[PDB]
PDB file of C-alpha atoms and ligand atoms in Angstrom:
ATOM      1  CA  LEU A   1     -47.034 -65.821-125.909  1.00  0.00           C
ATOM      2  CA  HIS A   2     -48.770 -68.070-128.438  1.00  0.00           C
ATOM      3  CA  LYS A   3     -47.790 -69.688-131.767  1.00  0.00           C
ATOM      4  CA  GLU A   4     -50.068 -69.154-134.749  1.00  0.00           C
ATOM      5  CA  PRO A   5     -49.925 -70.753-138.167  1.00  0.00           C
ATOM      6  CA  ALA A   6     -48.474 -69.289-141.301  1.00  0.00           C
ATOM      7  CA  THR A   7     -47.117 -70.465-144.608  1.00  0.00           C
ATOM      8  CA  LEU A   8     -44.040 -69.372-146.445  1.00  0.00           C
ATOM      9  CA  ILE A   9     -44.604 -67.148-149.470  1.00  0.00           C
ATOM     10  CA  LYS A  10     -40.911 -66.363-149.964  1.00  0.00           C
ATOM     11  CA  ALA A  11     -37.568 -65.915-148.336  1.00  0.00           C
ATOM     12  CA  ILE A  12     -36.350 -62.359-148.430  1.00  0.00           C
ATOM     13  CA  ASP A  13     -33.162 -61.920-146.379  1.00  0.00           C
ATOM     14  CA  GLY A  14     -31.556 -62.784-143.029  1.00  0.00           C
ATOM     15  CA  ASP A  15     -34.195 -61.187-140.868  1.00  0.00           C
ATOM     16  CA  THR A  16     -37.257 -60.613-143.126  1.00  0.00           C
ATOM     17  CA  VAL A  17     -39.467 -63.227-144.755  1.00  0.00           C
ATOM     18  CA  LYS A  18     -42.750 -63.108-146.697  1.00  0.00           C
ATOM     19  CA  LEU A  19     -45.433 -65.255-145.031  1.00  0.00           C
ATOM     20  CA  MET A  20     -49.127 -65.724-145.466  1.00  0.00           C
ATOM     21  CA  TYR A  21     -50.692 -64.989-142.076  1.00  0.00           C
ATOM     22  CA  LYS A  22     -54.451 -65.198-141.514  1.00  0.00           C
ATOM     23  CA  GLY A  23     -54.674 -65.639-145.309  1.00  0.00           C
ATOM     24  CA  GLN A  24     -52.911 -62.353-146.148  1.00  0.00           C
ATOM     25  CA  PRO A  25     -49.426 -61.835-147.528  1.00  0.00           C
ATOM     26  CA  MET A  26     -47.139 -59.967-145.156  1.00  0.00           C
ATOM     27  CA  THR A  27     -43.504 -59.227-144.747  1.00  0.00           C
ATOM     28  CA  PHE A  28     -42.281 -60.275-141.264  1.00  0.00           C
ATOM     29  CA  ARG A  29     -39.331 -58.680-139.569  1.00  0.00           C
ATOM     30  CA  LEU A  30     -37.778 -60.928-136.938  1.00  0.00           C
ATOM     31  CA  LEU A  31     -37.941 -59.509-133.442  1.00  0.00           C
ATOM     32  CA  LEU A  32     -34.818 -58.684-131.409  1.00  0.00           C
ATOM     33  CA  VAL A  33     -32.176 -59.408-134.054  1.00  0.00           C
ATOM     34  CA  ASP A  34     -30.278 -57.684-136.814  1.00  0.00           C
ATOM     35  CA  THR A  35     -28.804 -59.580-139.696  1.00  0.00           C
ATOM     36  CA  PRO A  36     -26.310 -57.871-142.052  1.00  0.00           C
ATOM     37  CA  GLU A  37     -27.846 -56.548-145.275  1.00  0.00           C
ATOM     38  CA  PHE A  38     -27.230 -58.767-148.254  1.00  0.00           C
ATOM     39  CA  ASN A  39     -24.606 -56.329-149.546  1.00  0.00           C
ATOM     40  CA  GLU A  40     -22.634 -56.481-146.189  1.00  0.00           C
ATOM     41  CA  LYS A  41     -20.301 -59.079-144.792  1.00  0.00           C
ATOM     42  CA  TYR A  42     -22.202 -62.218-143.657  1.00  0.00           C
ATOM     43  CA  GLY A  43     -25.374 -60.824-145.350  1.00  0.00           C
ATOM     44  CA  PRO A  44     -25.518 -63.528-147.972  1.00  0.00           C
ATOM     45  CA  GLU A  45     -24.834 -66.250-145.343  1.00  0.00           C
ATOM     46  CA  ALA A  46     -27.562 -64.856-143.068  1.00  0.00           C
ATOM     47  CA  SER A  47     -30.051 -64.741-146.009  1.00  0.00           C
ATOM     48  CA  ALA A  48     -29.178 -68.281-146.997  1.00  0.00           C
ATOM     49  CA  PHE A  49     -29.464 -69.560-143.457  1.00  0.00           C
ATOM     50  CA  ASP A  50     -32.937 -68.022-142.876  1.00  0.00           C
ATOM     51  CA  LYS A  51     -34.011 -69.246-146.368  1.00  0.00           C
ATOM     52  CA  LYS A  52     -32.999 -72.833-145.719  1.00  0.00           C
ATOM     53  CA  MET A  53     -34.623 -72.890-142.373  1.00  0.00           C
ATOM     54  CA  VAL A  54     -37.986 -71.564-143.591  1.00  0.00           C
ATOM     55  CA  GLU A  55     -38.005 -73.446-146.969  1.00  0.00           C
ATOM     56  CA  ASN A  56     -37.195 -76.824-145.372  1.00  0.00           C
ATOM     57  CA  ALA A  57     -39.832 -76.411-142.645  1.00  0.00           C
ATOM     58  CA  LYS A  58     -43.002 -78.457-142.776  1.00  0.00           C
ATOM     59  CA  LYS A  59     -44.631 -76.059-140.353  1.00  0.00           C
ATOM     60  CA  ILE A  60     -43.979 -72.326-140.023  1.00  0.00           C
ATOM     61  CA  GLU A  61     -45.374 -70.531-136.977  1.00  0.00           C
ATOM     62  CA  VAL A  62     -45.479 -66.905-135.922  1.00  0.00           C
ATOM     63  CA  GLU A  63     -45.430 -65.699-132.348  1.00  0.00           C
ATOM     64  CA  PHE A  64     -46.179 -62.103-131.629  1.00  0.00           C
ATOM     65  CA  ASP A  65     -44.854 -60.531-128.473  1.00  0.00           C
ATOM     66  CA  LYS A  66     -46.939 -58.379-126.060  1.00  0.00           C
ATOM     67  CA  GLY A  67     -46.315 -55.055-127.821  1.00  0.00           C
ATOM     68  CA  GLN A  68     -46.721 -53.668-131.293  1.00  0.00           C
ATOM     69  CA  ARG A  69     -47.286 -56.314-133.976  1.00  0.00           C
ATOM     70  CA  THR A  70     -46.461 -54.170-137.005  1.00  0.00           C
ATOM     71  CA  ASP A  71     -43.627 -51.700-137.431  1.00  0.00           C
ATOM     72  CA  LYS A  72     -43.727 -48.277-139.090  1.00  0.00           C
ATOM     73  CA  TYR A  73     -43.109 -49.981-142.446  1.00  0.00           C
ATOM     74  CA  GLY A  74     -46.134 -52.303-142.117  1.00  0.00           C
ATOM     75  CA  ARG A  75     -43.915 -55.329-141.388  1.00  0.00           C
ATOM     76  CA  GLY A  76     -45.133 -57.854-138.926  1.00  0.00           C
ATOM     77  CA  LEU A  77     -42.874 -58.139-135.888  1.00  0.00           C
ATOM     78  CA  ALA A  78     -42.648 -61.675-134.576  1.00  0.00           C
ATOM     79  CA  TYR A  79     -40.638 -64.617-133.448  1.00  0.00           C
ATOM     80  CA  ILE A  80     -40.696 -67.057-136.329  1.00  0.00           C
ATOM     81  CA  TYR A  81     -40.511 -70.860-135.833  1.00  0.00           C
ATOM     82  CA  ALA A  82     -39.573 -73.548-138.339  1.00  0.00           C
ATOM     83  CA  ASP A  83     -40.735 -76.983-137.196  1.00  0.00           C
ATOM     84  CA  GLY A  84     -40.708 -75.639-133.638  1.00  0.00           C
ATOM     85  CA  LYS A  85     -37.196 -74.127-133.872  1.00  0.00           C
ATOM     86  CA  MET A  86     -36.973 -70.331-133.540  1.00  0.00           C
ATOM     87  CA  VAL A  87     -35.290 -68.753-136.558  1.00  0.00           C
ATOM     88  CA  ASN A  88     -34.434 -65.641-134.522  1.00  0.00           C
ATOM     89  CA  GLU A  89     -32.577 -67.759-131.919  1.00  0.00           C
ATOM     90  CA  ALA A  90     -30.892 -69.963-134.550  1.00  0.00           C
ATOM     91  CA  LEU A  91     -29.438 -66.928-136.319  1.00  0.00           C
ATOM     92  CA  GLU A  92     -28.097 -65.709-133.003  1.00  0.00           C
ATOM     93  CA  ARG A  93     -26.618 -69.069-132.118  1.00  0.00           C
ATOM     94  CA  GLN A  94     -24.779 -69.206-135.441  1.00  0.00           C
ATOM     95  CA  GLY A  95     -23.230 -65.790-135.255  1.00  0.00           C
ATOM     96  CA  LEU A  96     -25.345 -64.549-138.194  1.00  0.00           C
ATOM     97  CA  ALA A  97     -27.180 -61.860-136.292  1.00  0.00           C
ATOM     98  CA  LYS A  98     -26.804 -59.445-133.394  1.00  0.00           C
ATOM     99  CA  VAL A  99     -29.362 -58.841-130.700  1.00  0.00           C
ATOM    100  CA  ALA A 100     -30.752 -55.409-131.450  1.00  0.00           C
ATOM    101  CA  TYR A 101     -33.889 -53.341-131.525  1.00  0.00           C
ATOM    102  CA  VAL A 102     -34.827 -54.339-128.007  1.00  0.00           C
ATOM    103  CA  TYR A 103     -37.850 -52.217-127.313  1.00  0.00           C
ATOM    104  CA  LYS A 104     -39.673 -52.338-123.884  1.00  0.00           C
ATOM    105  CA  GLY A 105     -42.813 -54.532-124.159  1.00  0.00           C
ATOM    106  CA  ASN A 106     -41.655 -56.570-127.157  1.00  0.00           C
ATOM    107  CA  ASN A 107     -38.660 -58.272-125.563  1.00  0.00           C
ATOM    108  CA  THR A 108     -39.981 -61.533-124.097  1.00  0.00           C
ATOM    109  CA  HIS A 109     -37.180 -63.636-125.615  1.00  0.00           C
ATOM    110  CA  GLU A 110     -34.322 -61.185-125.067  1.00  0.00           C
ATOM    111  CA  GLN A 111     -32.354 -63.210-122.616  1.00  0.00           C
ATOM    112  CA  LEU A 112     -32.818 -66.456-124.597  1.00  0.00           C
ATOM    113  CA  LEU A 113     -31.357 -64.711-127.654  1.00  0.00           C
ATOM    114  CA  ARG A 114     -28.526 -63.070-125.714  1.00  0.00           C
ATOM    115  CA  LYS A 115     -27.628 -66.399-124.287  1.00  0.00           C
ATOM    116  CA  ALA A 116     -27.360 -67.821-127.871  1.00  0.00           C
ATOM    117  CA  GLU A 117     -25.316 -64.821-129.006  1.00  0.00           C
ATOM    118  CA  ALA A 118     -22.935 -65.307-126.066  1.00  0.00           C
ATOM    119  CA  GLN A 119     -22.310 -68.887-127.100  1.00  0.00           C
ATOM    120  CA  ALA A 120     -21.748 -67.809-130.715  1.00  0.00           C
ATOM    121  CA  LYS A 121     -19.327 -65.158-129.431  1.00  0.00           C
ATOM    122  CA  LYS A 122     -17.472 -67.699-127.274  1.00  0.00           C
ATOM    123  CA  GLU A 123     -17.165 -69.933-130.333  1.00  0.00           C
ATOM    124  CA  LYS A 124     -15.976 -67.042-132.543  1.00  0.00           C
ATOM    125  CA  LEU A 125     -18.656 -67.857-135.164  1.00  0.00           C
ATOM    126  CA  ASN A 126     -19.185 -65.882-138.334  1.00  0.00           C
ATOM    127  CA  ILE A 127     -19.859 -62.273-137.224  1.00  0.00           C
ATOM    128  CA  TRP A 128     -17.779 -62.899-134.088  1.00  0.00           C
ATOM    129  CA  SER A 129     -14.822 -64.416-136.020  1.00  0.00           C
TER     130      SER A 129
HETATM  131  C1  LIG B   1     -36.873 -55.057-135.403  1.00  0.00           C
HETATM  132  C2  LIG B   1     -37.589 -53.776-135.416  1.00  0.00           C
HETATM  133  C3  LIG B   1     -37.251 -52.780-136.332  1.00  0.00           C
HETATM  134  N1  LIG B   1     -37.931 -51.661-136.363  1.00  0.00           N
HETATM  135  C4  LIG B   1     -37.564 -50.573-137.252  1.00  0.00           C
HETATM  136  C5  LIG B   1     -36.480 -49.709-136.609  1.00  0.00           C
HETATM  137  C6  LIG B   1     -35.606 -49.270-137.744  1.00  0.00           C
HETATM  138  O1  LIG B   1     -36.106 -47.999-138.232  1.00  0.00           O
HETATM  139  P1  LIG B   1     -35.198 -47.233-139.297  1.00  0.00           P
HETATM  140  O2  LIG B   1     -35.535 -47.840-140.646  1.00  0.00           O
HETATM  141  O3  LIG B   1     -35.721 -45.855-139.170  1.00  0.00           O
HETATM  142  O4  LIG B   1     -33.809 -47.417-138.955  1.00  0.00           O
HETATM  143  C7  LIG B   1     -35.813 -50.384-138.789  1.00  0.00           C
HETATM  144  C8  LIG B   1     -34.696 -51.391-138.812  1.00  0.00           C
HETATM  145  O5  LIG B   1     -35.133 -52.496-139.603  1.00  0.00           O
HETATM  146  P2  LIG B   1     -34.104 -53.161-140.584  1.00  0.00           P
HETATM  147  O6  LIG B   1     -32.977 -53.688-139.793  1.00  0.00           O
HETATM  148  O7  LIG B   1     -34.888 -54.239-141.281  1.00  0.00           O
HETATM  149  O8  LIG B   1     -33.611 -52.126-141.537  1.00  0.00           O
HETATM  150  O9  LIG B   1     -36.999 -51.050-138.461  1.00  0.00           O
HETATM  151  C9  LIG B   1     -38.977 -51.455-135.400  1.00  0.00           C
HETATM  152  O10 LIG B   1     -39.524 -50.322-135.375  1.00  0.00           O
HETATM  153  N2  LIG B   1     -39.301 -52.356-134.466  1.00  0.00           N
HETATM  154  C10 LIG B   1     -38.643 -53.538-134.445  1.00  0.00           C
HETATM  155  O11 LIG B   1     -38.925 -54.363-133.588  1.00  0.00           O
HETATM  156 CA1  LIG B   2     -31.075 -55.951-141.092  1.00  0.00          CA
END
């Protein structure tokens, strides 16, 4: 997999973010994770966490997996990095998302994320508290 540049347009919620990619505005949906909706428990904390990560970053990158790059809603599907740190993994490690939506062919970082979730679970963080 390869990292490609993008710039933040705006935070949306725990697992979606508006980025300019190849000069076009797009909503990105983070691969392999599920954050609570804003209206659900830990939703606001997940939204805030993703926001801080992407707003504080000097450099946002997107990394598509090997499979589909857009979902049925036109959202880009990617791993998103903030100064080289993966947002998807960071949410997992903090107990602010669950590994989910693991579809064959777009699951390169599955075990990395499951490992983070396990440590969050062990630590009883947030969703696992
Ligand atoms: C993460 C992800 C979600 N989706 C779709 C499946 C779900 O369809 P349904 O809307 O029919 O449930 C939806 C979940 O996204 P959200 O969690 O953002 O709602 O997005 C993909 O198709 N591929 C993906 O990789
Ligand atoms: Ca969600």
